[PDB]
Scaffold this active site. Sequence first.
Site, mmCIF file in Angstrom:
data_model
loop_
_atom_site.group_PDB
_atom_site.id
_atom_site.type_symbol
_atom_site.label_atom_id
_atom_site.label_comp_id
_atom_site.label_asym_id
_atom_site.label_seq_id
_atom_site.Cartn_x
_atom_site.Cartn_y
_atom_site.Cartn_z
ATOM 1 N N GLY A 24 -20.583 73.515 84.299
ATOM 2 C CA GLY A 24 -21.561 72.276 84.384
ATOM 3 C C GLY A 24 -20.823 71.043 84.022
ATOM 4 O O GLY A 24 -21.156 69.901 84.165
ATOM 5 N N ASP A 27 -23.364 68.696 72.392
ATOM 6 C CA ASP A 27 -23.164 69.994 72.834
ATOM 7 C C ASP A 27 -22.110 70.851 72.270
ATOM 8 O O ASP A 27 -21.111 71.306 72.318
ATOM 9 C CB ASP A 27 -22.673 70.013 74.473
ATOM 10 N N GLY A 29 -17.470 70.372 85.423
ATOM 11 C CA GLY A 29 -16.898 70.155 86.335
ATOM 12 C C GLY A 29 -15.606 71.200 86.753
ATOM 13 O O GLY A 29 -15.815 72.442 86.556
ATOM 14 N N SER A 30 -14.181 70.619 86.954
ATOM 15 C CA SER A 30 -13.368 71.716 87.184
ATOM 16 C C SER A 30 -12.008 71.033 86.321
ATOM 17 O O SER A 30 -11.667 69.828 86.560
ATOM 18 C CB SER A 30 -13.025 71.717 88.426
ATOM 19 N N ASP A 49 -9.692 78.300 73.002
ATOM 20 C CA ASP A 49 -10.918 77.866 72.666
ATOM 21 C C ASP A 49 -11.688 78.777 71.642
ATOM 22 O O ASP A 49 -11.383 79.965 71.589
ATOM 23 C CB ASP A 49 -11.856 77.543 74.052
ATOM 24 N N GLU A 103 -5.517 64.913 76.901
ATOM 25 C CA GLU A 103 -4.484 65.488 76.260
ATOM 26 C C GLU A 103 -4.641 67.106 76.231
ATOM 27 O O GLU A 103 -5.854 67.671 76.683
ATOM 28 C CB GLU A 103 -4.403 64.915 74.883
ATOM 29 N N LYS A 119 -9.389 66.685 84.465
ATOM 30 C CA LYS A 119 -10.722 67.017 84.780
ATOM 31 C C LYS A 119 -11.300 66.323 86.095
ATOM 32 O O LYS A 119 -11.210 65.095 86.120
ATOM 33 C CB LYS A 119 -11.527 66.673 83.344
HETATM 34 O O1 LIG Z 1 -6.560 70.795 77.131
HETATM 35 C C1 LIG Z 1 -7.665 71.123 77.547
HETATM 36 C C2 LIG Z 1 -8.638 70.088 77.586
HETATM 37 O O2 LIG Z 1 -8.185 68.866 77.361
HETATM 38 C C3 LIG Z 1 -9.738 70.239 78.033
HETATM 39 C C4 LIG Z 1 -11.018 69.379 78.179
HETATM 40 C C5 LIG Z 1 -11.128 68.014 77.681
HETATM 41 C C6 LIG Z 1 -12.228 67.367 77.910
HETATM 42 C C7 LIG Z 1 -13.379 67.784 78.693
HETATM 43 O O3 LIG Z 1 -14.275 67.157 79.048
HETATM 44 C C8 LIG Z 1 -13.346 69.159 79.059
HETATM 45 O O4 LIG Z 1 -14.459 69.847 79.624
HETATM 46 C C9 LIG Z 1 -12.155 70.091 78.801
HETATM 47 O O5 LIG Z 1 -10.187 71.638 78.307
HETATM 48 C C10 LIG Z 1 -9.429 72.847 78.311
HETATM 49 C C11 LIG Z 1 -9.893 73.920 78.545
HETATM 50 C C12 LIG Z 1 -9.118 75.314 78.488
HETATM 51 O O6 LIG Z 1 -9.348 76.381 78.611
HETATM 52 C C13 LIG Z 1 -7.402 75.032 77.982
HETATM 53 O O7 LIG Z 1 -6.645 75.939 77.825
HETATM 54 C C14 LIG Z 1 -7.058 73.426 77.568
HETATM 55 O O8 LIG Z 1 -5.709 73.319 77.184
HETATM 56 C C15 LIG Z 1 -7.961 72.528 77.690
#
Ligand SMILES: O=c1c(O)c(-c2ccc(O)c(O)c2)oc2cc(O)c(O)c(O)c12
Length: 274
Positions: free
Chosen positions: A16, A135, A18-19, A96, A89, A35
């Site tokens: 939800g 969220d 994006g990618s 996570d 970053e 993103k």
């Molecule tokens: O570093 C990020 C990051 O900035 C994000 C990030 C940062 C901002 C957003 O709005 C978002 O949806 C994701 O997400 C992820 C997700 C992962 O699984 C991972 O291994 C990551 O290293 C990261």
Amino acid sequence: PLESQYQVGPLLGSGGFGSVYSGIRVSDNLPVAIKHVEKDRISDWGELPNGTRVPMEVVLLKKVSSGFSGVIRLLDWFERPDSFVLILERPEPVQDLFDFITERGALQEELARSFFWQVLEAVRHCHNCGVLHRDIKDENILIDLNRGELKLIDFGSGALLKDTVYTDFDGTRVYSPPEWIRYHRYHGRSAAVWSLGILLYDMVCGDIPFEHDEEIIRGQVFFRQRVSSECQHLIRWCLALRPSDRPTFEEIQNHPWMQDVLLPQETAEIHLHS
Ligand SMILES: O=c1c(O)c(-c2ccc(O)c(O)c2)oc2cc(O)c(O)c(O)c12
């Protein structure tokens, strides 16, 4: 002044929000996350201080970007015909909280305390900056495994903070409070504290306490794991049915269960095999 200033890597996730891709800034080999959000699929739009329409997430990330490592920092952003591209970053190595809990089950209290405290510090930082996440949940929290530092991500369902009532919500339902379920109305802080209650339970039991609307409304908390009374007390407080009966951030941080928190570095040495 382009998109080729970054070498794009593998896709980290999609949903939800994006990618999101792993990336490296060629300017200086800095680890980054990239993103992409389609314009048609954007929930709430904001407007930059200098008048120009952008995804609300960009406005919020700018309001919170500073020295504080508790929130993922927005390094840069671009506009495309049909999408926006945020450059964020990226800690390395990282995991996570949702996956970390899937792999390790219910976290020991000492560890949940360090993590919960850090989430509290980050949510406080957002609130000081006039931003409400909306969220807060394990999937929106990253663990810098070397430093033992948690970072809040995905402000796409967020809003500018206010003292009046909210009648919109587009975050996670099972982390949403009873007053939303029942009346489609909530106040920002009290709703945040409720999700924090959901998140603490999740940490110490290894799963969220409620899956269906009827359970959220009823607010009866059952513990499926061994959890200290103090922790059970704090969780139940956060999950009080009436918003005004929930604790403030100060009350949470001065709660007996939250004393003697480990520093992030100690946390990684003891619990993250760092
Ligand atoms: O570093 C990020 C990051 O900035 C994000 C990030 C940062 C901002 C957003 O709005 C978002 O949806 C994701 O997400 C992820 C997700 C992962 O699984 C991972 O291994 C990551 O290293 C990261």
